[PDB]
Amino acid sequence: VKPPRINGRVPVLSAQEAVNYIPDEATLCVLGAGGGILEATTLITALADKYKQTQTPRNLSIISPTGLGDRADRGISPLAQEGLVKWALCGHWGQSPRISDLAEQNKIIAYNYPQGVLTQTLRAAAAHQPGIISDIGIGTFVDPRQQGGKLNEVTKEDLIKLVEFDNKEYLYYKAIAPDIAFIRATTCDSEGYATFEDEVMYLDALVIAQAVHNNGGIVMMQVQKMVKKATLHPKSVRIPGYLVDIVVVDPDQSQLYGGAPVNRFISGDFTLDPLNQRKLVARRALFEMRKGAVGNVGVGIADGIGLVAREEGCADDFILTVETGPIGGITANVNTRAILDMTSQFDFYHGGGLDVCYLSFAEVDQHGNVGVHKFNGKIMGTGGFIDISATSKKIIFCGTLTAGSLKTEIADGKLNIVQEGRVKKFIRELPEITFSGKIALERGLDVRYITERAVFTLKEDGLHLIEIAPGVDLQKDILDKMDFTPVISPELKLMDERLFIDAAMGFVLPEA
Amino acid sequence: VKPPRINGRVPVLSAQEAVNYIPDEATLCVLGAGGGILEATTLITALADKYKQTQTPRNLSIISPTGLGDRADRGISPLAQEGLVKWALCGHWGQSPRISDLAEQNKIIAYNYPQGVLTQTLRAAAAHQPGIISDIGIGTFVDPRQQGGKLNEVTKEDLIKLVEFDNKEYLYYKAIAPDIAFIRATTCDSEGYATFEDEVMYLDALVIAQAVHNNGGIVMMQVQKMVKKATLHPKSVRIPGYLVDIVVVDPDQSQLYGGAPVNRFISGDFTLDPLNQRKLVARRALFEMRKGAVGNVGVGIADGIGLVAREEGCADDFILTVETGPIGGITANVNTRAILDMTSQFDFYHGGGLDVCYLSFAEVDQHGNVGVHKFNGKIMGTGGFIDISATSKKIIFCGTLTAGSLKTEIADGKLNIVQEGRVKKFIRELPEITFSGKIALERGLDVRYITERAVFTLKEDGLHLIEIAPGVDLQKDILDKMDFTPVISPELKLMDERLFIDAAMGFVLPEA
Amino acid sequence: VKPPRINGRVPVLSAQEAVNYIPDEATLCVLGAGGGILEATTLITALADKYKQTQTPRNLSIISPTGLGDRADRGISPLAQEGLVKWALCGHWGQSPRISDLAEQNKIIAYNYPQGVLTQTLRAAAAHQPGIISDIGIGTFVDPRQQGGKLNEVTKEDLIKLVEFDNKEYLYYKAIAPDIAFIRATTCDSEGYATFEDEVMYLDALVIAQAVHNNGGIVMMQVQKMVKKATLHPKSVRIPGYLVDIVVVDPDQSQLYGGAPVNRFISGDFTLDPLNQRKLVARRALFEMRKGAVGNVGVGIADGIGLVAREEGCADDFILTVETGPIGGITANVNTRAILDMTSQFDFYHGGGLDVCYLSFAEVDQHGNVGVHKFNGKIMGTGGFIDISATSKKIIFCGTLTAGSLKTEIADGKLNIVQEGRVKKFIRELPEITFSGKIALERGLDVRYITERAVFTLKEDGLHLIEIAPGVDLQKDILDKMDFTPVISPELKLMDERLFIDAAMGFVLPEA
């Protein structure tokens, strides 16, 4: 039961008034990405506050297409009060760690669909399609022959099923419709027609609204301001008003966490005019780039690639895409070239649209398998990791060879390990697989593992060590630091000297 | 083989040069809707001319998400030269009759997926998904238990398969990826980043470009003009440049057929300041609307409802959507409220988003089945007919009770049949089903049949005659004009007197 | 000396650095209007700071086209440090009372050209025209046969001359070019090309820049942000970059005083969806309006006219203009219809553009002269008072009959004077004239004086009392509160009954 539209006007309520419409056992879908991107914060806050006061509502199911928050107490962490949530399906878990703490402790039912697939299943749910068929996730923990995307012991119901079409294997992911949506826009009119002029991006706001709407649910939308009916440009409207049931106006709405005023460069309206192991990894990663290539750099040790490219003078000769929608731009990013909706961005990725992608790793095993969704006893989830490493033409894994307070220095054109890491990242067998070396080889993909001391390539007989850093001993610093035996390439070479010098490399971008 | 990007710029070619890249047996996807909407005319023309002069390329497959053309010699009719096209899959067939003539004559393999499903399968193909699961089309000619969407005898290969998920029936539609795209935008930059500021709508341009791009195909895009790199607004860009392989610049590009100059009302930039049998049907159809309902712009006798609502002064109390993406507006419409891409519009329709849908009929049978895709020996195809009649809450069929130049006069608050139609439309059994009466009843839907002389409702025991026009004889003008016997409602009443008076009805729209 | 433009880039400096370029005895022109409108606050602050610390620069002349500030210590009040300013020409004086205090104490030379004329003379100085010829001010204190616009005893040099053209009297006003400008915009590119997208209005920013530029001076411009060269829309650029010598960037720049975040209704980008003595005068003033008439938004007791017209439902039937350039709109207005530069607005006023003009009064004498520029021993200055009262078709003076905490109660459809004002406003002879009753009659102008208790009209033989408020004694409340005897109209009536009733009047605006 939703509040009625008096004279066609969308009901405007306080966030407190709005969350009173959430019943027990509602399935709530939360729009947003990291650091407050498109987050309906007042709604999340109101719901957390209501439960802290009344212990209602109870036993909600959460769908969070991507990870909200600050990797601490923001995002949907405030909703991790015991009894409020009973079940969650998220594309990324570590960004709101209070919820993943609940999953770790078997206190909630917990699934992780690949972020891209997840938003695709919400779009299917909008259309009352029962699920989607995709080979994204075959051979990983989301494959039912492994964990079926289940994150803990208490999670039992099979959502993902193995199916066959054209004599090929695919996964079938069940499409689940939400009952409630917390979405957000910059501005809407008196009938709820909404524009995103100052938002960092779009994500899958329309998809979420349609899925909840067509499930007889309540769409609640936070906006910064409301305007007169039919005065927005029709080509700027991203959500038709009839999809929205309740509007909350937050005149203090901020583009990102931190309360900074609207930045119109971030909005897209104006054109804006240190050698460590992380720069080293980003540098060697750039060597994998080609002229005209479409790539994706992931958060982590490689996210410096764009900067290195700018330093090297080749940043305009390829294009980097962001999983959530933005295309191009410089360090939120500014001077973007385009912004797609998140679902469409993932459709592109799934079909092998990326020439090169760069992903972090927590662990690598003898098979070339990579883990990121669980490590160190913690649940992190995938984000778009599976969507990106499943079919991209070249997969470039980036990270240090060891972990746990590793300290290095790059001086005199060499790598100095001043304090070796406590933890081996190169292990015999992954407890759980996020990326399958076997499937990537079956798909004909080119797989690299770039570290600060060593570079490997995946082959049919495992990892071949192809490059070794200056200042590093093969036996003591590499072979003694891995819990498996890599093939040593007969072509083994020192890593390019330029990488280790604190000056522009004179790198010239190859054209294939 | 595609032309190389020189200096990072998208290759710019004449239409003639561009079409020389199309090999024998390629699968060509053509963007566009009726009357020139988003049609890359210079590319269709050049391809037609090349075959006329050289009889190359040969044996192409065509995918046409919706119907292009003018119901005569434009659209893809120029491509109906014998030997050029071997195979076609279209969401609508009558808009380019030369192509549908080849289908009727068994000269080409010919399939009709529901337009909405068709564009969704292209989106699936972009993602390398093998097909989609949907209950849209169950119980109709697209059902493999009937014709499986095959339009003639020569068409043999099954593309649609019956599947089961959670003890429910669904159709599995195979996703086919094209090899070549003819797309279009208003403007692009030197790297192919494209905006649609002057286009009537967006259709599924991005979906088509992604589908062809991720199938290693060639995307060819017609634009009116090109601008300096990175000078377009990132939030206005609908097609990222890396999806585009060839740009054709047509300075004389027209929004619609007819050569008229750009109309900035049609672009969305500015706000614009007879009682016959068709108006009669549109008026009675308006009675089915209520405040706050979402309905669709109908094609045919139903298209006059908006104008009637305006006359009665209730046009702002509800919203009509257009299958191809536009939402709201007045008579290409102007003063629209929003424009979605076409695929997302059908996602909405499939999930039962329409409270009311208005559709024409060619034939109705004793089971309440409706036929429009084939009649009078001709292939028309569906357009969005199945996508809209499958799950919409109220299904309102509109048309005259007989066909073949029926003439009536509305005089003295009565209907006078002055020249009875030659052809009976209410027949015993449909040779081919576009809409299933049984399925609609299973789905809980409210089904009306509105004619100029009589109104019916579908019930479990068949059609109930509920209303009769003043001036008409039940026996001679209705019963004798149907090949089956409807149930006569015991509450049988005259159609509202005001419908038949040539003044404003003073109609008041029912509450929300 | 101005800083060099490195590679064509406009020098960017801190406000502190920028103000170091100001030498002793510079003529400084300061952009802005009341309450922070278009005020380069960092530049005023930095200059005031500089003088407080160093007692340099010295003996500056100020030109301030209109009044800046908050009628207290903001605006150019910080510049009222003795020794800093020696001379000032301002269009309004009471908005920055520390400066007018200096003028009252004969501490500076002090002139008041009418605001419209003053901005016209700056435009003249841009063109190196020696002065302007206008009949605006004839018969007032700005007329050299009176005070010549000199505000104190220390002010001696004649700036204004009586001249003769076409057998008519005119004033010649000397055009004085400034040496330094403090201007402001929202955004500029790297070459100084500036846009005003978020500013409340434009004022005379371009005029100031040209005047200073063509006088070999230094133009200093505060902006909120800077963008890449040539990325701003050429038709939004109000100031060509070659006019700008130094830019100061203030990322925290606020539309008005108060530090509120940018309001996009105020920017012009979006459409926004008690009966006391002041409302009473506003109501009676509205009676003077007619459909299609062009009026001014008044400053003072007149400012309520728009809200009364909205209450009465006739706000859209006429247009009110703002002296500083905005046209139309609702309560910084929002939903304006147009924004002109300030000088053009006054061009319009000077030629008799206003059908109706609403103005406050401090004093009225027996000749119907009005005084606002001096009273109660203080200098207020004119603002646009003379520009608007000189030639508007109807001149409607609005104010209470007495001053000095007059308190009234409007109960039972009558006026009750509960506390009489201590000061008589209707005196025998104005010591200094702001509006000439004689010149108004010569010009054929219709002149009204509306009070809470009485309404007068100026005639050839003096003020005629035409209306008396119910509840008021003619002798004690009116005649005894004036130092002259008005003619009592034979047609003297009570003020319209509805004015004194606390409900909507049912007022019908007179026809065009």
Next chain:
Amino acid sequence: VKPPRINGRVPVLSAQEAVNYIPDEATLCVLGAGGGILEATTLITALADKYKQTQTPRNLSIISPTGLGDRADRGISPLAQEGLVKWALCGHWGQSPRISDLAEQNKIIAYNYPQGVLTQTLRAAAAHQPGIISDIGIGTFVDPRQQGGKLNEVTKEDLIKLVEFDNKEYLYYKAIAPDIAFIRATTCDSEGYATFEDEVMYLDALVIAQAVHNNGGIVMMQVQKMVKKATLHPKSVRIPGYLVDIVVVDPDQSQLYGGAPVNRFISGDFTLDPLNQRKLVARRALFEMRKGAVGNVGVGIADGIGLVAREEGCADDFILTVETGPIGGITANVNTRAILDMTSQFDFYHGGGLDVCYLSFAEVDQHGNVGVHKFNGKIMGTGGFIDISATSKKIIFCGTLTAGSLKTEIADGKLNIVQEGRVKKFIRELPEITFSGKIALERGLDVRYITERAVFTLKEDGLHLIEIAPGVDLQKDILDKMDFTPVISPELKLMDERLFIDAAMGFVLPEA
């Protein structure tokens, strides 16, 4: 005689009905520049048709701030029917030669104010100022000591007189207000509020509208389209609707003559991606430019300077402005940097804003006087020649040394005169002066004369020949071709060799 605004709507009429409001002896002001720029063509056409058919209205006065037309039968040429025009005042005369033919034959009273001054006097008229005081035109034919702006014998009444202020000489130009205006915009709302989004520029449309409006006249505005009230952006509106009395809608309205469709590069909305005597002169003219200079390249042999600059790679190091408003841009122009209204542009010029101006000459005399307004027994008028040559810092006159079928050829680094001109352009004494060498030297300006064969500089003792083309004889090709003897510089040198070589000069623009 003006049509009433029904319900606040501006009267919309055909051009034929519109011109019916023009009475005998009205003063008509016509907006527009060369080649159809901002020309209300339908209104000129309809007035011209009315007179051709009815011989009314009669004896109109024409004010044309600048020259309209194609130097033939367009512009205001259609208005040159005998008895229609009695009196004309234009800033330029050669652009509509049929009207100047009338002046030449003493058929009409004919004046030429300098273009800039003329538009300034219309602005002064809007404010009911009687005239403007300006030193622009001192010592030229507009000086009453010479011709007083009068173009023929029948022109008697004095409009321009000599005055004195600050013991300096000035011209006083009488301000004449028109009774009728033909203005134009792109779009207006239903109340006349007008925007110029697709117009080439703004010229002085607002000034003309205010001038006529405040003279109780009729303002007629041609637009391409009309829109709903209050839907245009207020910051885009250039003309407030209450200034407009009749609107004429021409849906076929073209940006320029020739009926080409709207060009959005010309509108300002998008960023666009042979050695003869003319190029030679343009090249030598470029030598006079420096980095950071503000220039104005004029009509004729100079107009090639921008292209030469682009060719030499220094086009972005200085800025050229156009007298009618546009600033910057490339070959109407595109990629402009800003567009001022015309009057404001001339304010800037009048105050010495131009560092360099480039002007054409018809005749030069021994004193360095230049003639362009009259030559070869024809009236050309000034355009903005006087406004620009009066106070600009450097005045570069550009032309050939002789006229009338002069053919030259440049190769082997020399000038070859193949056919000498019939007409000597360097004469003893100008019959009428357009530019005064004496006045320029008084004002301390640097005056150059560039021809294909010789370069001169004006000094106190006349023209110094400072440069001579290679391949040319001093006595035969220069001295024998002049009617006075120039001073031969002792530093006389060959014109730069690179000027006469068909390759890039490697020219470096001197520093700021």
